[PDB]
């Protein structure tokens, strides 16, 4: 398996960071298998697929609401079960009215998973619409969701095998011209860092 030379990674400054424009902490995470990194993403297939994917996500959220309404009606019946002897019988009101707070927790329960799935789908779609090369994705769950739903349209890995791809897919001329442009007409810490 490919490895990296220690001299060009743990140096001051980190001469491998200046080349890929990454912070040394990110290199420390990626190289020793503690974070994922995407290397390339083709934008055309993503571009002409937005409508279908968002429609499918809307269908998935409708699937959530399908369970939502039934859960709401079941909760209503469960609360009516306790309400059957609430203000009409001789049962002490303490527990028979704290079951109302229990039912507040119950009605929040279904909306909990509902909002969980809503947020899940929203963040997945937003991340898939924001992906750019050299972005770190910790917490595998997100990466699994991305590689299952949007399995194509991007590539990402972990370790020195991905650093190799990042170095290979680097255009010296374009970066050099951009940096020279910045140092030519620029002001602030940007000029110092580009120099």
């Amino acid at each position: 398996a490919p490895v990296t030379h220690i001299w060009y990674f743990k140096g001051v400054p980190s001469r491998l960071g200046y080349l890929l424009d990454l912070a040394p902490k990110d290199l420390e995470k990626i190289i020793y298998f503690a974070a994922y990194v995407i290397t390339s993403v083709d934008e055309e297939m993503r571009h002409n697929e937005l409508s279908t994917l968002e429609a499918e996500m809307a269908v998935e959220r409708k699937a959530v609401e399908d369970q939502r309404d039934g859960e709401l009606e079941a909760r209503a019946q469960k609360l009516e079960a306790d309400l059957a002897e609430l203000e009409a019988e001789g049962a002490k009101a303490d527990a028979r009215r704290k079951v109302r707070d229990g039912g507040e927790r119950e009605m929040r329960q279904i909306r909990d998973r509902a909002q969980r799935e809503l947020d899940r789908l929203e963040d997945i779609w937003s991340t898939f619409t924001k992906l750019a090369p050299k972005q770190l994705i910790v917490d595998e769950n997100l990466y699994r969701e991305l590689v299952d739903r949007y399995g194509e349209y991007f590539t990402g890995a972990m370790g020195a095998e991905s650093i190799q791809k990042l170095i290979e897919n680097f255009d010296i001329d374009a970066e050099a011209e951009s940096l020279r442009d910045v140092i030519r007409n620029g002001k602030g810490q940007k000029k110092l860092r580009a120099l």
Partner: protein, 48 residues
């Protein structure tokens, strides 16, 4: 320091020829990377 590298490499190859799951194999690759980094410059990061 050569011996540890050439032992860890052989263990990684044997474990990678058995169709082992991803987690174990990447843990082994991390250990190999640490071994090589300790060969070239010992104590630069972590514990010597």
């Amino acid at each position: 320091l050569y011996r540890r590298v050439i032992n860890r490499n052989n263990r990684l190859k044997r474990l990678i020829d058995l169709g082992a799951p991803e987690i174990i194999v990447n843990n082994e690759k991390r250990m190999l990377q640490e071994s090589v980094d300790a060969l070239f410059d010992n104590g630069r990061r972590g514990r010597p």
